[PDB]
CSV table of C-alpha atoms and ligand atoms in Angstrom, one decimal:
chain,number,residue,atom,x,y,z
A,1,UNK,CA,0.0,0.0,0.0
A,2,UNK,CA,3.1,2.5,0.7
A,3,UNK,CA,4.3,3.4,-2.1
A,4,UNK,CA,8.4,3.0,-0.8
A,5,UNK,CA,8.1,0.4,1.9
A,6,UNK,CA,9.1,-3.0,0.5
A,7,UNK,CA,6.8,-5.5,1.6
A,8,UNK,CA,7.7,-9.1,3.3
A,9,UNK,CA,6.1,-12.2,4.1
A,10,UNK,CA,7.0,-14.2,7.5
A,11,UNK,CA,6.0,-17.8,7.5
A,12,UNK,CA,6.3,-19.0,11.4
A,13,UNK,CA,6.5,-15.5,12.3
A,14,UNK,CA,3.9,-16.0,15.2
A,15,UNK,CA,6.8,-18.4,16.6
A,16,UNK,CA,10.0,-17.7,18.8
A,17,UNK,CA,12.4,-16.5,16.2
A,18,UNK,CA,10.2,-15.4,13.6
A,19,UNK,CA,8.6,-12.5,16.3
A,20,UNK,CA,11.8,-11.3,17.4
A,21,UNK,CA,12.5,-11.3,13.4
A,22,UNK,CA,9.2,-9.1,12.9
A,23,UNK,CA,10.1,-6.8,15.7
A,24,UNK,CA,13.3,-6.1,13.9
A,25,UNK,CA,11.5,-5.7,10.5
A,26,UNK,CA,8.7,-3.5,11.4
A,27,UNK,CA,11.2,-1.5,13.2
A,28,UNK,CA,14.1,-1.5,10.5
A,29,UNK,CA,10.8,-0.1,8.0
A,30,UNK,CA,9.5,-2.8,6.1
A,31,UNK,CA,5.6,-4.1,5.5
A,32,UNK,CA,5.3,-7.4,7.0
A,33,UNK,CA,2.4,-10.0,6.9
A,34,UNK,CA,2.9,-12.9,9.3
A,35,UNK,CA,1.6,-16.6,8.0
A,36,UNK,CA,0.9,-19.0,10.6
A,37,UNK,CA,-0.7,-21.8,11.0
A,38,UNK,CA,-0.8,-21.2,15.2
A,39,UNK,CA,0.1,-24.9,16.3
A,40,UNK,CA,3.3,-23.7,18.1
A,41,UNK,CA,2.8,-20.2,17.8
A,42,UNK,CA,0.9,-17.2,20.0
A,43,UNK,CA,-2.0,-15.3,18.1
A,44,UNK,CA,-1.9,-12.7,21.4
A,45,UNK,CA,1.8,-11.6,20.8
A,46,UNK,CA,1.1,-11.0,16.8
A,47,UNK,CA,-2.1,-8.7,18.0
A,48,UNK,CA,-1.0,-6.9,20.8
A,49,UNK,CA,3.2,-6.8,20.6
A,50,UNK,CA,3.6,-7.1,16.9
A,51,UNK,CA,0.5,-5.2,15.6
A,52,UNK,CA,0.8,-6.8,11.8
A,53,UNK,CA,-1.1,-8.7,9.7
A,54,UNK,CA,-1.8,-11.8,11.0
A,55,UNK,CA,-2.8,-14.8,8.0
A,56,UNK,CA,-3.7,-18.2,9.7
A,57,UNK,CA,-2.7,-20.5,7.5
A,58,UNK,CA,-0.9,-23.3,6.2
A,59,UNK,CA,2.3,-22.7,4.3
A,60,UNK,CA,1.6,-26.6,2.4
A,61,UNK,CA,-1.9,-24.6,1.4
A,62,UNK,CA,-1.7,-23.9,-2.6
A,63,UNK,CA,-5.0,-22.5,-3.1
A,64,UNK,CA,-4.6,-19.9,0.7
A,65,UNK,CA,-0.9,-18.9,-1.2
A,66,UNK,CA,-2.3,-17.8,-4.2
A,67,UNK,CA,-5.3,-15.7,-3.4
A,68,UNK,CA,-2.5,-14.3,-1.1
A,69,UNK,CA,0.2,-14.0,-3.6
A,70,UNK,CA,-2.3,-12.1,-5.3
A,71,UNK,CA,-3.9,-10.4,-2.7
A,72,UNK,CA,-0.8,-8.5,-2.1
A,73,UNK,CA,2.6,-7.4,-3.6
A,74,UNK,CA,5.8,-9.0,-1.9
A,75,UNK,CA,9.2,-8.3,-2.3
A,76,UNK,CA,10.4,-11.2,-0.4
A,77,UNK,CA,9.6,-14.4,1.8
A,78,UNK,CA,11.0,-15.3,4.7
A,79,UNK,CA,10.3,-19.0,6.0
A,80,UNK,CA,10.6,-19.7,10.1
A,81,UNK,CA,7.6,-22.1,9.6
A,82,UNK,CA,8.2,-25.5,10.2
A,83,UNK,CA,8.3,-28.6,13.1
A,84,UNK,CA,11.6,-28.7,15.2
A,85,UNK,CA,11.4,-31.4,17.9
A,86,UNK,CA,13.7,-33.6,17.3
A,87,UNK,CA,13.0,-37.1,19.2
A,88,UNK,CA,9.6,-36.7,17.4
A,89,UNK,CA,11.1,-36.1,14.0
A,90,UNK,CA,12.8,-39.9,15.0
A,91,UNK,CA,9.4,-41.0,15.9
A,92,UNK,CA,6.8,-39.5,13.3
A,93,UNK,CA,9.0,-38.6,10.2
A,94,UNK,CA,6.2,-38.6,7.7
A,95,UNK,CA,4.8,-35.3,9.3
A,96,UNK,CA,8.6,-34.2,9.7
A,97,UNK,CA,8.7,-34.2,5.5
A,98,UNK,CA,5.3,-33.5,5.3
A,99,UNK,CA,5.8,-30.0,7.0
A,100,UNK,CA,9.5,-29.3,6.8
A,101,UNK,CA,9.7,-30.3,2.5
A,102,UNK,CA,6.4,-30.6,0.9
A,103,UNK,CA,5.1,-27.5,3.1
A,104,UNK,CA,8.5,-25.5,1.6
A,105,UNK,CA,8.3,-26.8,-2.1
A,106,UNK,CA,4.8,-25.6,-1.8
A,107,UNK,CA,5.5,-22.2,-0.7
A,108,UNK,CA,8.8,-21.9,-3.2
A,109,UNK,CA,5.8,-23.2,-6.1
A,110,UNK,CA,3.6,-20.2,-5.2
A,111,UNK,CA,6.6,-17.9,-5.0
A,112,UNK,CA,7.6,-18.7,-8.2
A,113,UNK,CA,4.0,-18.3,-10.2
A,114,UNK,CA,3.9,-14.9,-8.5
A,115,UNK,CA,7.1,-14.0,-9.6
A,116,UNK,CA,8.6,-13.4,-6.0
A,117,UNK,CA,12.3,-14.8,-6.4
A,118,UNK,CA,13.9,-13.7,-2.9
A,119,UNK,CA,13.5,-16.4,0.1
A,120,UNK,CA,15.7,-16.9,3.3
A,121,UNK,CA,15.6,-19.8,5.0
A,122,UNK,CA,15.7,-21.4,8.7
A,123,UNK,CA,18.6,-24.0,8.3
A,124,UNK,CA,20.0,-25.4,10.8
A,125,UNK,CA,23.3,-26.8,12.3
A,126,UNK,CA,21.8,-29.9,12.5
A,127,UNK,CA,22.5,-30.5,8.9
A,128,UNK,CA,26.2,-31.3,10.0
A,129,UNK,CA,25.5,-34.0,11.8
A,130,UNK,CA,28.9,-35.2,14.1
A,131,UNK,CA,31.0,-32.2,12.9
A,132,UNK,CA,34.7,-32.9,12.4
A,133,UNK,CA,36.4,-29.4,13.5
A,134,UNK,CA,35.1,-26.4,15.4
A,135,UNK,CA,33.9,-23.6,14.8
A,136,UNK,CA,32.5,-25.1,12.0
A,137,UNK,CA,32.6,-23.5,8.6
A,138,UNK,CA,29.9,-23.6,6.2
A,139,UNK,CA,31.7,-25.8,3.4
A,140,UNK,CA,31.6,-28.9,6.4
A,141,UNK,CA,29.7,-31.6,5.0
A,142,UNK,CA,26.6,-31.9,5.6
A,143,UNK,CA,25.3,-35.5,6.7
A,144,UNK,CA,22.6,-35.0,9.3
A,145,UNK,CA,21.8,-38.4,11.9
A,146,UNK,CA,17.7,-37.4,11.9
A,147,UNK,CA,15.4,-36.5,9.8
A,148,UNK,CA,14.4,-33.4,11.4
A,149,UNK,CA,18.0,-32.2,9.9
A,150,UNK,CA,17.5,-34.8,6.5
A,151,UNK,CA,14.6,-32.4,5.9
A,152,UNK,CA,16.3,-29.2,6.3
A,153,UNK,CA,19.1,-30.3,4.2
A,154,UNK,CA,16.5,-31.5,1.4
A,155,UNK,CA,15.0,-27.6,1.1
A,156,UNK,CA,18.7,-26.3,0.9
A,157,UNK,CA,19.5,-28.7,-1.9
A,158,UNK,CA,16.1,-27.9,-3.3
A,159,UNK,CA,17.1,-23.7,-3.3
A,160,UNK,CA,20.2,-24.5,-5.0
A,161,UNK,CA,18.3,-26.3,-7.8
A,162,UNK,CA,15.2,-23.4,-7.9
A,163,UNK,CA,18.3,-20.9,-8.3
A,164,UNK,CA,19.5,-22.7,-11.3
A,165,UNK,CA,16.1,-23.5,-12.8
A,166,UNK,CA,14.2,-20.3,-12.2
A,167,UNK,CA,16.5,-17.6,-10.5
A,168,UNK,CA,15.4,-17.8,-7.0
A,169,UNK,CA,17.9,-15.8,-4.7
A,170,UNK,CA,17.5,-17.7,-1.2
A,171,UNK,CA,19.8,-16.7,2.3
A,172,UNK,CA,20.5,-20.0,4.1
A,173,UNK,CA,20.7,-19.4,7.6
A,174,UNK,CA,22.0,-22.5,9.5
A,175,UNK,CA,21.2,-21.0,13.3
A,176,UNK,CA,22.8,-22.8,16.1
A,177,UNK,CA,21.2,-22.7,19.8
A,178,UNK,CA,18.5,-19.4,19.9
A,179,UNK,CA,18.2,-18.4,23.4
A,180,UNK,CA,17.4,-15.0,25.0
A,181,UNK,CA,14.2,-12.5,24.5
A,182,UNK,CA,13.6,-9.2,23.7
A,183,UNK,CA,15.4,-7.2,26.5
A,184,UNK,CA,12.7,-5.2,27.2
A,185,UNK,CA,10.4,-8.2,27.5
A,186,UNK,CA,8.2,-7.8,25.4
A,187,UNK,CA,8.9,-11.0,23.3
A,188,UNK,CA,10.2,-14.6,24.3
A,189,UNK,CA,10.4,-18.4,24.0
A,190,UNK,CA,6.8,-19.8,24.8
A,191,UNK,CA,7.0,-23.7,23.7
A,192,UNK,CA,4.5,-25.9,24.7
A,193,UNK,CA,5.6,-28.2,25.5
A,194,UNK,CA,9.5,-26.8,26.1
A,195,UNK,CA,11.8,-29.2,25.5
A,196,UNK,CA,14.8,-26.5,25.0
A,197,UNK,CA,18.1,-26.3,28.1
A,198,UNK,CA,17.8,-22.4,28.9
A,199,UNK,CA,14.0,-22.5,29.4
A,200,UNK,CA,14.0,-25.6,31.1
A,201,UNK,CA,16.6,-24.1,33.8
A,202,UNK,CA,14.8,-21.1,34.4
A,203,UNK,CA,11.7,-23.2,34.9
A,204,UNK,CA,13.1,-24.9,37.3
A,205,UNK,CA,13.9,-21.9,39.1
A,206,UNK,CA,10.6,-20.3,38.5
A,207,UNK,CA,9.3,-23.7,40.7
A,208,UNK,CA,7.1,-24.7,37.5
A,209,UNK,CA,9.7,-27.8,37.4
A,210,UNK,CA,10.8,-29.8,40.2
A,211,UNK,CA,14.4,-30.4,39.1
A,212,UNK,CA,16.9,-29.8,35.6
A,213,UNK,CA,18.0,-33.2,33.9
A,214,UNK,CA,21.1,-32.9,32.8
A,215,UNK,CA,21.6,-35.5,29.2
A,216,UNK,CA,24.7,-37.2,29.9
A,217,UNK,CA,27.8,-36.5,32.4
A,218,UNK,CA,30.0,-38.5,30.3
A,219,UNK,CA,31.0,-36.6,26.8
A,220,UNK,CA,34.8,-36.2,25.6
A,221,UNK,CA,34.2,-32.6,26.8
A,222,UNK,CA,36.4,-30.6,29.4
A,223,UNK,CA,33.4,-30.5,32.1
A,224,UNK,CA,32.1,-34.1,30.6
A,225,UNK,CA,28.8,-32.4,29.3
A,226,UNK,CA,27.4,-31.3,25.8
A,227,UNK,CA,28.8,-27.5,24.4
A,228,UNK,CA,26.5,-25.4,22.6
A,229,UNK,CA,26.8,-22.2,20.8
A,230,UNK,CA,24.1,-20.0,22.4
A,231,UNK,CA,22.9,-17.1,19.8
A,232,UNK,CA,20.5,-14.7,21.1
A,233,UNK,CA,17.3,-14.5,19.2
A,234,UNK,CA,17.7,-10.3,18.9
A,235,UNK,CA,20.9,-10.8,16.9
A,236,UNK,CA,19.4,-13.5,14.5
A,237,UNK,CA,17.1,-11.1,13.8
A,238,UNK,CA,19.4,-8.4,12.6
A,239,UNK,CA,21.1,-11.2,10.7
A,240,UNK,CA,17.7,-11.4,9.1
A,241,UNK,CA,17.0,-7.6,8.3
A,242,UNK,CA,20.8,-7.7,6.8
A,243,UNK,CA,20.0,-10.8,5.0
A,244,UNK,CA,16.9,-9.5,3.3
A,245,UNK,CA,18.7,-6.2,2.4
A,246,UNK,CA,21.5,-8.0,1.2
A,247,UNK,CA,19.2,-9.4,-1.3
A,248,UNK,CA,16.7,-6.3,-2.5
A,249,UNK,CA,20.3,-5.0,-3.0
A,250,UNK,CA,20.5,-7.6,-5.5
A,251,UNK,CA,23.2,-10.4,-3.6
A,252,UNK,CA,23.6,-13.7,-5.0
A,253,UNK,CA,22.3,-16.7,-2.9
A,254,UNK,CA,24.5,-17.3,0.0
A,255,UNK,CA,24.5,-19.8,3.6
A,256,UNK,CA,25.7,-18.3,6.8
A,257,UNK,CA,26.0,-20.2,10.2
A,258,UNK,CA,24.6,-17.8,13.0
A,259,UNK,CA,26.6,-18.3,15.7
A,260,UNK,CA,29.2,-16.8,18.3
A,261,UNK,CA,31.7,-19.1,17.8
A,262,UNK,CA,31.9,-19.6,21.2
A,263,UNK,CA,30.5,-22.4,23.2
A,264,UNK,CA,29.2,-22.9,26.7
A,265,UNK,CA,28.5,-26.3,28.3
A,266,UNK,CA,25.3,-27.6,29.9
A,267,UNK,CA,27.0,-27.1,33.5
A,268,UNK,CA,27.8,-23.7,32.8
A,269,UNK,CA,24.2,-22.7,31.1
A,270,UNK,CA,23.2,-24.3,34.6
A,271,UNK,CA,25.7,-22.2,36.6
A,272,UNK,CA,24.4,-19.0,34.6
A,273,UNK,CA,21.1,-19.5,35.9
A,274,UNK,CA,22.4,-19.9,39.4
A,275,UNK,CA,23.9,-16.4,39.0
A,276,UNK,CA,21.4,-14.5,37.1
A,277,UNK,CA,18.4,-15.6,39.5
A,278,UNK,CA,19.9,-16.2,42.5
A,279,UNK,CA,17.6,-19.1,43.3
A,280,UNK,CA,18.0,-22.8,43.9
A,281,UNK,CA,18.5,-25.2,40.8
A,282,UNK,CA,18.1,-28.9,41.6
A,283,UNK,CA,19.7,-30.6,39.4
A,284,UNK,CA,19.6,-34.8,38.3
A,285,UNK,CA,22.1,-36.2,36.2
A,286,UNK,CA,20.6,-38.7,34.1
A,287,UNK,CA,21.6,-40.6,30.9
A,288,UNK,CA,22.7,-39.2,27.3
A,289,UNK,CA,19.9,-38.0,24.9
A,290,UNK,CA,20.2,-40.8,21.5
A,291,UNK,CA,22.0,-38.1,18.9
A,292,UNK,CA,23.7,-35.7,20.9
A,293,UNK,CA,27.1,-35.0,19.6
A,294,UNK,CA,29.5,-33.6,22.0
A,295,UNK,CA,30.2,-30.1,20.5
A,296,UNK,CA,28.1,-27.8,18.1
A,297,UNK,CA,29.6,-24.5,17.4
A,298,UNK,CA,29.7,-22.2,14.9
A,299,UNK,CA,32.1,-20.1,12.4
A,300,UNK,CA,30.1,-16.6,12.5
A,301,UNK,CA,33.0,-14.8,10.3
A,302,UNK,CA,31.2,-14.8,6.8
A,303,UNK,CA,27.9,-13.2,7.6
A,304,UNK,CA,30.1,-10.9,10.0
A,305,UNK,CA,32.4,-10.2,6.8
A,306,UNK,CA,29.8,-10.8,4.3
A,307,UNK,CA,26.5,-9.0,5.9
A,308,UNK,CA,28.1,-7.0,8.2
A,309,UNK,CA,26.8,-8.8,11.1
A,310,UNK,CA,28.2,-8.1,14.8
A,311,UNK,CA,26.3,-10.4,17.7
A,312,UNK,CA,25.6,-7.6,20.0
A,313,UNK,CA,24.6,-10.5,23.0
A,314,UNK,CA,26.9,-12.9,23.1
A,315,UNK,CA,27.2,-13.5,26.7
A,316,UNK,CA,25.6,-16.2,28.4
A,317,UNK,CA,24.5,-13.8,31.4
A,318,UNK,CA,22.9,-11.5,28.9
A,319,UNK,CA,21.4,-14.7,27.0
A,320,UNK,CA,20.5,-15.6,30.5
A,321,UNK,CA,19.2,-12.6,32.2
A,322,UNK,CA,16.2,-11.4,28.9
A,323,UNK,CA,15.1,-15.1,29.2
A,324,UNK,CA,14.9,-14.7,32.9
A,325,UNK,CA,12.8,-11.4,32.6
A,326,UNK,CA,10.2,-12.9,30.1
A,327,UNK,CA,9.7,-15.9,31.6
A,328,UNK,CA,9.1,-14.4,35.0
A,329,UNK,CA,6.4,-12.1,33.4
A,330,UNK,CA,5.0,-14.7,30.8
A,331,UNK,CA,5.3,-18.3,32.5
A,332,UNK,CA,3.9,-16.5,35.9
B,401,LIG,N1,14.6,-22.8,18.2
B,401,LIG,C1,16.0,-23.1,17.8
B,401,LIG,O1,16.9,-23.3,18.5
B,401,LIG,C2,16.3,-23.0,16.3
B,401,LIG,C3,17.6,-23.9,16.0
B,401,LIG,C4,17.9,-24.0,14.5
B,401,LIG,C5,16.8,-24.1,13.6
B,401,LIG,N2,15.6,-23.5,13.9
B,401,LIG,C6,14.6,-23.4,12.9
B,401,LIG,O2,14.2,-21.9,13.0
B,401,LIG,C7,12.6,-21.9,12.6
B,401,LIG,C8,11.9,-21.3,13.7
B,401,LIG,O3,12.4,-21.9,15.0
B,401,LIG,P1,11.4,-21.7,16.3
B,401,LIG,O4,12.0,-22.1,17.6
B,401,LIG,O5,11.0,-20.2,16.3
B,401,LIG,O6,10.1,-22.7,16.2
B,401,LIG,P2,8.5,-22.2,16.6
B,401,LIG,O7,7.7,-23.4,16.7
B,401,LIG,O8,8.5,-21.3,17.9
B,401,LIG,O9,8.1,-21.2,15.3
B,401,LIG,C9,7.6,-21.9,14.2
B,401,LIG,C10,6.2,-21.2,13.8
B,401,LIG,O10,5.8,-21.9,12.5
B,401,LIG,C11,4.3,-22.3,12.7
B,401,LIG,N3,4.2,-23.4,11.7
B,401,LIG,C12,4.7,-24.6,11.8
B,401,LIG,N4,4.3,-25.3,10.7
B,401,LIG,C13,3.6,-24.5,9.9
B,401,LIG,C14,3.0,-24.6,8.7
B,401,LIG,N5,3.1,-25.8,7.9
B,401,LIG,N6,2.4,-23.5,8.2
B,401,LIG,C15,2.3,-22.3,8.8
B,401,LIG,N7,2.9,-22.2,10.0
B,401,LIG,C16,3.5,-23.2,10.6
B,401,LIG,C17,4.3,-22.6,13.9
B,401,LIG,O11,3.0,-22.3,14.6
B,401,LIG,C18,5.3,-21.6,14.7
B,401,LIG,O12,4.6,-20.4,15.1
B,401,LIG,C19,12.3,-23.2,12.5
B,401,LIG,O13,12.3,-23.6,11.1
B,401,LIG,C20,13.4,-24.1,13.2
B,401,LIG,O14,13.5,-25.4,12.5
B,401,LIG,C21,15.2,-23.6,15.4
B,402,LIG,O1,16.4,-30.7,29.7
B,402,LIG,C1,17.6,-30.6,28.9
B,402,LIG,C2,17.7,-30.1,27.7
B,402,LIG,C3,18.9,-30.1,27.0
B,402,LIG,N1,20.0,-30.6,27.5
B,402,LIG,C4,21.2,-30.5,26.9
B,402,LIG,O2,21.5,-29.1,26.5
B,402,LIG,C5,21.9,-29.1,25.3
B,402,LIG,C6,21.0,-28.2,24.4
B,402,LIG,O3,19.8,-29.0,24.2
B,402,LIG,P1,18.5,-28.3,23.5
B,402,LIG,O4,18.1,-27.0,24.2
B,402,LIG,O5,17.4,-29.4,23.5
B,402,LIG,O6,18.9,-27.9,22.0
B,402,LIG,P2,19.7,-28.8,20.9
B,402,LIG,O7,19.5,-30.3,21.1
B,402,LIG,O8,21.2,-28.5,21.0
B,402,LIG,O9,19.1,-28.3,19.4
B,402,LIG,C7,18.6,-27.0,19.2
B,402,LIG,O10,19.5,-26.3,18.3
B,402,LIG,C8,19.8,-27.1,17.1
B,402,LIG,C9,20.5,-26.4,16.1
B,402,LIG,O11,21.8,-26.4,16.5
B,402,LIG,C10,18.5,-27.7,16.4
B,402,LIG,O12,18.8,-29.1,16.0
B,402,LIG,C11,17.2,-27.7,17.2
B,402,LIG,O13,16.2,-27.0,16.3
B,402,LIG,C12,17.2,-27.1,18.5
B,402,LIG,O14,16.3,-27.8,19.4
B,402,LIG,C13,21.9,-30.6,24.7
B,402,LIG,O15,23.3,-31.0,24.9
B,402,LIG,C14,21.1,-31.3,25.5
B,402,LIG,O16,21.5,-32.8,25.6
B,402,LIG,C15,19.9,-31.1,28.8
B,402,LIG,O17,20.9,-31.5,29.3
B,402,LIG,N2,18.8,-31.1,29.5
């Protein structure tokens, strides 16, 4: 309707990083519509924190994409939406590639008839699979243990192929660990049910779980448990605004890990908590989760040299302390 404002479609963004990814948007000037299909995601912090369009919707939906597609101009597409549990990805795959490939293809079909040709993507370091070196780089190879990452590794083969066939420019984003909230609150992780280390502590702090499991004591690891590369979900979403400039700009297609290259441990996430809400922790030491490789982190220096991008949280208190504030105010 604005005659400047480029205009941008959101797919998951009524989810944990697609809000924060709206926030920064909205507030970086662009038109954004939000598809959702609300079976993860809030409709109450689209309407009342976001304030944007708000489609429910399927993104596997041909007929809903069209009359959308022609509803409406878009510049561009970003893609959050998709299923990310793990164990169940073991369990149920069908509705893993379902969702994850058919529900993309879908969505890169509509694109395509509309004449949109600018997508990023929500990859993931789970493509890797048992990485060989840290901080990993993006040429590793990529042979993913579940299908959860076999389905994320599918769509990025799938770009590569669209960008041959038909010109589509796509940012691959491969994010490690998201953690953290809007600092002032206003946004954060609300997964039900939450599976994820960082909420889980705080939880347990919070008294709305009895105790913290830690997944194996055991690891080749320094402290004998599992290092992650924590990324708070504020700076993945100014990898995101420099992602979509980069490519209204014209940039060819392009993957960047998202990531600190720096890694903390599950005993010092733990010991984080300790210190940010002063509170008892109980903690239980139980068994290795099936899959978990010992160390995940990431190689941030392309987008930093490619995009420009500087992590502006990359502390685990900071990561810590905005998770603490929303889920005191959210998880009351
Ligand atoms: N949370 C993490 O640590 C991070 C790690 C790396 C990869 N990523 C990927 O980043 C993306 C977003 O992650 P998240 O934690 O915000 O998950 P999320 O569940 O909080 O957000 C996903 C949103 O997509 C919606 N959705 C799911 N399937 C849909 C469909 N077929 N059509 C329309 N909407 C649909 C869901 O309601 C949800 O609101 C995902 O693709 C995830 O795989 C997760
Ligand atoms: O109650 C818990 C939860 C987690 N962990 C451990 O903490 C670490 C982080 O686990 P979790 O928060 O579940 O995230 P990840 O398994 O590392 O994977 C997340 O980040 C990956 C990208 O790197 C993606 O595969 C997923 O979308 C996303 O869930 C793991 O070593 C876990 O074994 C625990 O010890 N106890």
């Amino acid at each position: 309707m604005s005659p400047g404002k480029p205009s941008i479609l959101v797919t998951g963004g009524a989810g944990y990083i697609g809000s924060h990814t709206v926030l920064a948007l909205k507030q970086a000037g662009y038109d954004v519509v939000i598809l959702d299909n609300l079976v993860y995601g809030h409709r109450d912090l689209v309407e009342k924190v976001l304030q944007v369009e708000l489609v429910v919707g399927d993104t596997g939906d041909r007929p809903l994409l069209d009359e959308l597609f022609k509803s409406r101009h878009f510049d561009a597409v970003m893609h959050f939406s998709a299923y990310a549990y793990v164990g169940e990805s073991v369990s149920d795959p069908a509705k893993y590639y379902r969702n994850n490939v058919l529900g993309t293809l879908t969505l890169l079909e509509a694109m395509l008839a509309a004449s949109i040709n600018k997508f990023v993507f929500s990859s993931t370091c789970a493509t890797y699979g048992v990485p060989k070196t840290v901080p990993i780089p993006e040429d590793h190879p990529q042979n993913p243990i579940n299908p959860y990452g076999a389905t994320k590794l599918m769509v990025e083969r799938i770009l590569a192929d669209f960008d041959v066939a038909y010109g589509l420019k796509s940012v691959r984003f491969r994010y490690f660990n998201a953690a953290g909230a809007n600092p002032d609150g206003l946004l954060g992780e609300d997964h039900n049910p939450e599976t994820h280390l960082i909420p889980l502590v705080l939880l347990t702090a919070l008294g709305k779980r009895k105790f913290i499991s830690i997944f194996g004591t055991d690891y080749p690891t320094p402290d004998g448990t599992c290092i992650r590369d924590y990324i708070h979900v504020n700076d993945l979403a100014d990898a995101h605004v420099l992602g979509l400039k980069y490519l209204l700009k014209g940039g060819d297609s392009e993957v960047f890990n998202l990531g600190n290259g720096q890694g903390f441990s599950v005993r010092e996430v733990i010991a984080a908590g300790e210190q940010v809400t002063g509170l008892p922790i109980t903690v239980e030491e139980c068994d290795r989760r099936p899959g978990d490789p010992p160390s995940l982190i990431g190689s941030g220096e392309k987008a930093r040299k490619i995009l420009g991008w500087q992590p502006q949280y990359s502390s685990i208190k900071d990561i810590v302390s905005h998770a603490w504030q929303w889920h005191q105010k959210r998880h009351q």
